[PDB]
Design an enzyme around this catalytic site. Sequence first.
Site, PDB file in Angstrom:
ATOM      1  N   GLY A  23       0.830  -1.188   0.000  1.00 35.53           N
ATOM      2  CA  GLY A  23       0.000   0.000   0.000  1.00 35.53           C
ATOM      3  C   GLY A  23       0.856   1.226   0.000  1.00 35.53           C
ATOM      4  N   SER A  24       1.080   1.752  -1.199  1.00 39.99           N
ATOM      5  CA  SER A  24       1.841   2.989  -1.430  1.00 39.99           C
ATOM      6  C   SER A  24       0.930   4.189  -1.143  1.00 39.99           C
ATOM      7  CB  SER A  24       2.354   3.025  -2.884  1.00 39.99           C
ATOM      8  OG  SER A  24       1.304   2.722  -3.824  1.00 39.99           O
ATOM      9  N   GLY A  25       1.306   5.376  -1.637  1.00 38.73           N
ATOM     10  CA  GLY A  25       0.425   6.566  -1.638  1.00 38.73           C
ATOM     11  C   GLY A  25       0.051   7.127  -0.268  1.00 38.73           C
ATOM     12  N   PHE A  27       0.311   9.274   3.321  1.00 37.47           N
ATOM     13  CA  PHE A  27       1.242   8.979   4.460  1.00 37.47           C
ATOM     14  C   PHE A  27       2.661   8.435   4.070  1.00 37.47           C
ATOM     15  CE2 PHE A  27       0.339   4.268   4.948  1.00 37.47           C
ATOM     16  CZ  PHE A  27      -0.861   4.147   4.229  1.00 37.47           C
ATOM     17  N   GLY A  28       2.717   7.127   3.800  1.00 38.36           N
ATOM     18  CA  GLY A  28       3.908   6.451   3.317  1.00 38.36           C
ATOM     19  C   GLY A  28       3.581   5.128   2.646  1.00 38.36           C
ATOM     20  N   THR A  29       4.404   4.131   2.958  1.00 38.73           N
ATOM     21  CA  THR A  29       4.414   2.839   2.262  1.00 38.73           C
ATOM     22  C   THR A  29       4.330   1.683   3.272  1.00 38.73           C
ATOM     23  OG1 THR A  29       6.079   4.013   0.955  1.00 38.73           O
ATOM     24  CG2 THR A  29       5.535   1.754   0.268  1.00 38.73           C
ATOM     25  N   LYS A  49       5.879  -0.486   8.226  1.00 33.90           N
ATOM     26  CA  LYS A  49       5.357   0.812   7.794  1.00 33.90           C
ATOM     27  C   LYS A  49       6.436   1.897   7.825  1.00 33.90           C
ATOM     28  CE  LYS A  49       1.901   3.208   9.847  1.00 33.90           C
ATOM     29  NZ  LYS A  49       0.555   3.788  10.057  1.00 33.90           N
ATOM     30  N   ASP A 141     -10.710   6.735  15.813  1.00 33.28           N
ATOM     31  CA  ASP A 141     -10.759   6.494  14.353  1.00 33.28           C
ATOM     32  C   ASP A 141     -11.206   5.049  13.939  1.00 33.28           C
ATOM     33  OD1 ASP A 141     -10.583   7.145  11.541  1.00 33.28           O
ATOM     34  OD2 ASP A 141      -8.443   6.701  11.538  1.00 33.28           O
ATOM     35  N   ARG A 145     -12.124   0.387   7.689  1.00 32.17           N
ATOM     36  CA  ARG A 145     -10.831   0.510   6.983  1.00 32.17           C
ATOM     37  C   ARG A 145      -9.707   0.269   7.992  1.00 32.17           C
ATOM     38  NH1 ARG A 145     -10.341   6.062   8.657  1.00 32.17           N
ATOM     39  NH2 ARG A 145     -12.575   6.505   8.397  1.00 32.17           N
ATOM     40  N   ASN A 146     -10.003   0.438   9.282  1.00 30.35           N
ATOM     41  CA  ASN A 146      -9.020   0.200  10.328  1.00 30.35           C
ATOM     42  C   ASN A 146      -9.233  -1.079  11.108  1.00 30.35           C
ATOM     43  OD1 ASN A 146      -7.815   2.634   9.646  1.00 30.35           O
ATOM     44  ND2 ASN A 146      -9.042   3.767  11.130  1.00 30.35           N
ATOM     45  N   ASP A 159      -4.490   0.944  13.363  1.00 34.60           N
ATOM     46  CA  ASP A 159      -4.391   2.389  13.200  1.00 34.60           C
ATOM     47  C   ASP A 159      -4.597   3.225  14.439  1.00 34.60           C
ATOM     48  OD1 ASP A 159      -4.267   5.028  11.900  1.00 34.60           O
ATOM     49  OD2 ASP A 159      -4.480   3.867  10.062  1.00 34.60           O
TER      50      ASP A 159
END
Length: 302
Positions: A23-25, A27-29, A49, A141, A145-146, A159
Amino acid sequence: EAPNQALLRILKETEFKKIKVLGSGAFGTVYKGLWIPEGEKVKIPVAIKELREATSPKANKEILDEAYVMASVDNPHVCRLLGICLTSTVQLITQLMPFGCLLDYVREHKDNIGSQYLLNWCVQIAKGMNYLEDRRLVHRDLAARNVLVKTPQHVKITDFGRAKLLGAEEVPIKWMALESILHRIYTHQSDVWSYGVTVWELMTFGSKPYDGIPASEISSILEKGERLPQPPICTIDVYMIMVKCWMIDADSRPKFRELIIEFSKMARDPQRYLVIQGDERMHLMDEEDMDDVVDADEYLIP
Ligand SMILES: CCN1CCN(Cc2ccc(-c3cc4c(N[C@H](C)c5ccccc5)ncnc4[nH]3)cc2)CC1
């Protein structure tokens, strides 16, 4: 206040081979990889991460905050930090959850997901959250997705980028309690509101809440008394629980320990509570040197 005696483990970059991006893009990688602890004859599948190269002291203070929180948590339904790597840019290292996040997973498998699984997820996320509450953490949060998937039967909250202690004072609109959009109050009970939404994501198999309605409108809609609609597969018993997580009077919402109990009763007769076409018949990783692979959950430290 009890002293925090969690162990933060610093890990040598030589102890682990990166193996693939996941998972790029933004925040980071995030990478899949393997970790061979010092001289121990185990290989531990991990996610790594390493925030987007640029080392702005800003984002460092942020990832180490996660590290701090993730290292202090210990529960089967919460994702644990295995350690950090202080490379040039700080890598977070955690147990690999190979199936990705629960949002994608329901989205991608709608036709194969039974009532037993949806209610078990609900039970497990409530246990996760109840545990945080015990350790007085407010996640701030929670969303599908988390939540990550270790196997289709075993999920864990992740997360911690916004976790804080209760009392402490130190943006996802659509998952937020009203007191939070209005006043940035955030309580274990505002977490419960988001549980509400998370559950609704799963019963609609991955829908986006208030699809269309833009964030500015949200607090108004909610003040007018609007909530999310009953998803097709939901008995009123289930939907009534969601609704309660969305009560204005925050103390009126259920406690996580109650949610564990209610979904758990429900999970004993899943078809009484969720109505899914085809329910009765639904059913739900590299190299050859895999002799020594051990899951993090089976790797304990003194
Ligand atoms: C149709 C589904 N598709 C193909 C399969 N997956 C690809 C995928 C697999 C694993 C993961 C993954 C992310 C992740 C993860 N990420 C969190 C944010 C993290 C936190 C601290 C340190 C490292 C990672 N943690 C643990 N295990 C993980 N596994 C993400 C995407 C999902 C998308």
